[PDB]
Structure formats: structure tokens, C-alpha cells
């Protein structure tokens, strides 16, 4: 609901953190990534900057 551009992404292992100014995301798949099971969740709301 808020058009947030994506600036920083840090891959660990099974999750990819997406960081945009007011909203942060986790990209986790389970098993293979494989598009159908790609998933995203809005975890935190803290502020990052350019």
C-alpha cells in the first residue's frame, strides 16, 4: 500500500532481507526458491535512508 523503492538487500542463506525506507521485507521460499514458492512478508517498519 505504500510505493516503496527497494535499496538494500542482504542474502544470508534461506532468507533475503529487503530494505525500503519505511518498510522491511523477508524473501523466504522453503525448499527450492522456484517462483511459486517465493513468498514475502512485511516484518518491520523502521526507517532506513539512502
Amino acid at each position: 500500500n505504500r510505493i516503496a523503492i527497494l535499496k538494500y538487500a542482504v542474502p544470508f542463506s534461506e532468507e533475503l532481507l529487503i530494505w525500503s525506507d519505511e518498510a522491511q521485507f523477508v524473501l523466504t521460499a522453503s525448499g527450492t526458491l522456484t517462483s511459486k514458492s517465493v513468498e514475502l512478508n512485511l516484518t518491520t517498519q523502521f526507517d532506513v535512508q539512502d
Binding site: 522453503s30 522456484t34 517462483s35 511459486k36 514458492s37 517465493v38 513468498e39
Partner: protein
Amino acid sequence: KMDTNQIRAVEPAPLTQEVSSVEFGGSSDET
């Protein structure tokens, strides 16, 4: 895993092809 679960429930059918053939009778000749 909503996308993976639902796509597994799609299950389209293969429907292999099937064809038949023509027939001719012939005639019997008199005189």
C-alpha cells in the same frame, strides 16, 4: 506456499490422439 499448492491441484488432461481409417467394399462382376 499458496501458489505451489493450488497449481498442484490444476491437473490438466493429456488427451492423447486417436484416429481411424476408411473402408472400401468392392464389386462383383457379372458377364
